[PDB]
Design an enzyme around this catalytic site. Structure first.
Site, mmCIF file in Angstrom:
data_model
loop_
_atom_site.group_PDB
_atom_site.id
_atom_site.type_symbol
_atom_site.label_atom_id
_atom_site.label_comp_id
_atom_site.label_asym_id
_atom_site.label_seq_id
_atom_site.Cartn_x
_atom_site.Cartn_y
_atom_site.Cartn_z
ATOM 1 N N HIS A 78 8.122 28.151 8.310
ATOM 2 C CA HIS A 78 8.924 29.264 7.734
ATOM 3 C C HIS A 78 10.372 28.789 7.577
ATOM 4 C CE1 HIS A 78 5.684 32.414 9.049
ATOM 5 N NE2 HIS A 78 5.192 31.408 8.333
ATOM 6 N N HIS A 235 2.958 34.794 0.807
ATOM 7 C CA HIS A 235 3.218 34.121 2.093
ATOM 8 C C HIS A 235 2.536 32.733 2.112
ATOM 9 C CE1 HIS A 235 4.683 33.845 6.083
ATOM 10 N NE2 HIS A 235 3.560 33.133 6.256
ATOM 11 N N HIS A 262 -2.582 24.661 6.494
ATOM 12 C CA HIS A 262 -1.691 23.592 7.034
ATOM 13 C C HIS A 262 -2.441 22.239 7.038
HETATM 14 O O1 LIG Z 1 -1.920 33.113 12.635
HETATM 15 C C1 LIG Z 1 -1.862 34.235 12.159
HETATM 16 N N1 LIG Z 1 -2.226 34.486 10.903
HETATM 17 C C2 LIG Z 1 -2.723 33.471 9.993
HETATM 18 C C3 LIG Z 1 -2.727 34.048 8.580
HETATM 19 C C4 LIG Z 1 -1.330 33.960 7.985
HETATM 20 C C5 LIG Z 1 -1.282 32.641 7.232
HETATM 21 N N2 LIG Z 1 -0.655 31.606 8.032
HETATM 22 C C6 LIG Z 1 0.646 31.613 8.307
HETATM 23 O O2 LIG Z 1 1.410 32.487 7.931
HETATM 24 C C7 LIG Z 1 1.162 30.466 9.123
HETATM 25 C C8 LIG Z 1 0.460 30.441 10.470
HETATM 26 C C9 LIG Z 1 1.317 31.321 11.363
HETATM 27 F F1 LIG Z 1 0.792 32.586 11.371
HETATM 28 C C10 LIG Z 1 2.701 31.331 10.725
HETATM 29 N N3 LIG Z 1 2.594 30.672 9.410
HETATM 30 C C11 LIG Z 1 -2.730 32.271 6.934
HETATM 31 N N4 LIG Z 1 -3.538 33.218 7.694
HETATM 32 C C12 LIG Z 1 -4.857 33.355 7.605
HETATM 33 O O3 LIG Z 1 -5.498 32.869 6.687
HETATM 34 C C13 LIG Z 1 -5.552 34.139 8.676
HETATM 35 C C14 LIG Z 1 -6.823 33.517 9.245
HETATM 36 C C15 LIG Z 1 -6.913 34.713 8.303
HETATM 37 C C16 LIG Z 1 -1.392 35.388 13.003
HETATM 38 C C17 LIG Z 1 -0.519 36.355 12.517
HETATM 39 C C18 LIG Z 1 -0.119 37.411 13.337
HETATM 40 C C19 LIG Z 1 -0.571 37.529 14.651
HETATM 41 C C20 LIG Z 1 -0.200 38.515 15.395
HETATM 42 C C21 LIG Z 1 0.008 39.504 16.029
HETATM 43 C C22 LIG Z 1 0.072 40.634 16.648
HETATM 44 C C23 LIG Z 1 0.465 41.759 15.935
HETATM 45 C C24 LIG Z 1 0.535 43.000 16.559
HETATM 46 C C25 LIG Z 1 0.212 43.130 17.905
HETATM 47 C C26 LIG Z 1 0.296 44.505 18.535
HETATM 48 N N5 LIG Z 1 1.120 44.583 19.750
HETATM 49 C C27 LIG Z 1 1.289 46.011 20.067
HETATM 50 C C28 LIG Z 1 2.236 46.210 21.245
HETATM 51 O O4 LIG Z 1 3.491 45.595 20.965
HETATM 52 C C29 LIG Z 1 3.341 44.197 20.733
HETATM 53 C C30 LIG Z 1 2.437 43.969 19.525
HETATM 54 C C31 LIG Z 1 -0.191 42.006 18.623
HETATM 55 C C32 LIG Z 1 -0.260 40.763 17.996
HETATM 56 C C33 LIG Z 1 -1.448 36.588 15.177
HETATM 57 C C34 LIG Z 1 -1.877 35.518 14.401
HETATM 58 CL CL1 LIG Z 1 -3.006 34.289 15.064
HETATM 59 ZN ZN LIG Z 2 3.250 31.535 7.561
#
Ligand SMILES: O=C(NC[C@H]1C[C@@H](NC(=O)[C@@H]2C[C@H](F)CN2)CN1C(=O)C1CC1)c1ccc(C#Cc2ccc(CN3CCOCC3)cc2)cc1Cl
Ligand SMILES: [Zn+2]
EC number: 3.5.1.108
Length: 297
Positions: A78, A235, A262
């Site tokens: 990012h 994104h 990636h």
């Molecule tokens: O890795 C994540 N997403 C991957 C997504 C975005 C793209 N990669 C990117 O953007 C790259 C890779 C990195 F993401 C950055 N750049 C590709 N992609 C895909 O293709 C996905 C596989 C389908 C990710 C995003 C948000 C949370 C999250 C979260 C979360 C949200 C809300 C809560 C709720 N809680 C409630 C209480 O307060 C705290 C939050 C908890 C966890 C966890 C994860 Cl694991």
């Molecule tokens: Zn990203």
């Protein structure tokens, strides 16, 4: 002539790591000519510095990680996206921890911090990698491609079998469309089901609606919704622009992603670097006749 740029002033910012859930202190510093982008773990003694280069990419699962021995920097893509879009050649990225802060999930906070500080032209020509040949990598149904292009352009397509996917394709010629306006606010995103699992394995500890689009089977759970009709594919473009910047030089050419990420973006980088027949390094004695353009500093 098109000159190297660094920061005019230092930038200090605070945030949380998406995976680590760790508070992190970020310092962006000017750097000399021909430094490149260098990430620096200031919490260690001695201090450890990893140049943001394709050779220094670790195991590509969660995000783009830089590695040197058993020291890492998680989730660089990012910030590297932001720096690419503003044409920053030289800078020191200081971190008080293992992970770059997530901020709002987009590059926008990073782009603002950089333009607030201002940019400085330096007395040296900017070096550009120009794609001369098509270079393409596939694995299963994913594909990632460089195609020659007198400018800089990124196209992407995704295909999730899921009600929320809206437009799943986009293309941006960054010589006629603003990175700042059209791509930099595009937020990371995550499925309710995945996040429930990943949290259980001590991952995504810093995630929240404040920094991610959260999605169940049917709708964005985020109360104020999306910033773009096509935020998700936007994104992917933003992430791609970050990974491309690990080449260590700005690109004249086009990138095409089909369900890419990636890992395969990194394979494409390696395959491109390896085939010197496919690219050349060029400078420009005259901006007025260059295929890409930059903002005033
Ligand atoms: O890795 C994540 N997403 C991957 C997504 C975005 C793209 N990669 C990117 O953007 C790259 C890779 C990195 F993401 C950055 N750049 C590709 N992609 C895909 O293709 C996905 C596989 C389908 C990710 C995003 C948000 C949370 C999250 C979260 C979360 C949200 C809300 C809560 C709720 N809680 C409630 C209480 O307060 C705290 C939050 C908890 C966890 C966890 C994860 Cl694991
Ligand atoms: Zn990203």
């Amino acid at each position: 002539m098109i000159k190297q740029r660094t920061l005019k002033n230092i930038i200090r910012a605070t945030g949380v790591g998406l995976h680590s859930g760790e508070k992190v202190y970020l310092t962006l510093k000017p750097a000399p000519v021909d430094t490149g982008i260098v990430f620096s773990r200031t919490d260690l003694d001695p201090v450890v510095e990893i140049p943001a280069r394709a050779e220094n990419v670790g195991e590509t699962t969660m995000s783009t990680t830089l590695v040197k021995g058993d020291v890492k920097v998680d989730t660089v893509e990012h910030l590297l996206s932001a720096m690419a879009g503003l044409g920053i050649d030289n800078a020191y990225v200081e971190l008080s921890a293992s992970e770059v802060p997530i901020m709002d999930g987009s590059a926008g906070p990073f782009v603002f911090l950089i333009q607030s500080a201002g940019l400085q032209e330096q007395e040296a020509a900017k070096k550009f990698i120009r794609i001369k040949r098509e270079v393409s990598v596939e694995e299963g149904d994913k594909r990632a491609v460089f195609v020659p292009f007198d400018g800089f352009k990124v196209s992407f397509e995704i295909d999730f079998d899921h009600p929320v996917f809206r437009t799943q394709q986009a293309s941006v010629d960054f010589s006629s469309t603003s990175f700042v306006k059209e791509v930099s606010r595009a937020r990371t995103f995550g499925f309710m089901r995945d996040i429930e699992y990943l949290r259980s394995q001590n991952l995504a500890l810093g995630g929240s609606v404040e920094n991610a689009i959260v999605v169940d089977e049917n709708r964005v759970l985020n109360e104020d919704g999306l910033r773009y009709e096509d935020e998700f594919v936007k994104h992917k473009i933003l992430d791609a622009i970050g990974d491309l910047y690990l080449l260590g030089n700005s690109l004249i050419g086009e990138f095409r992603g089909f369900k890419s990420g990636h890992a395969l973006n990194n394979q494409l980088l390696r395959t491109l670097i390896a085939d010197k027949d496919a690219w050349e390094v060029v400078t420009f004695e005259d901006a007025r006749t260059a295929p890409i353009s930059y903002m005033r500093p």
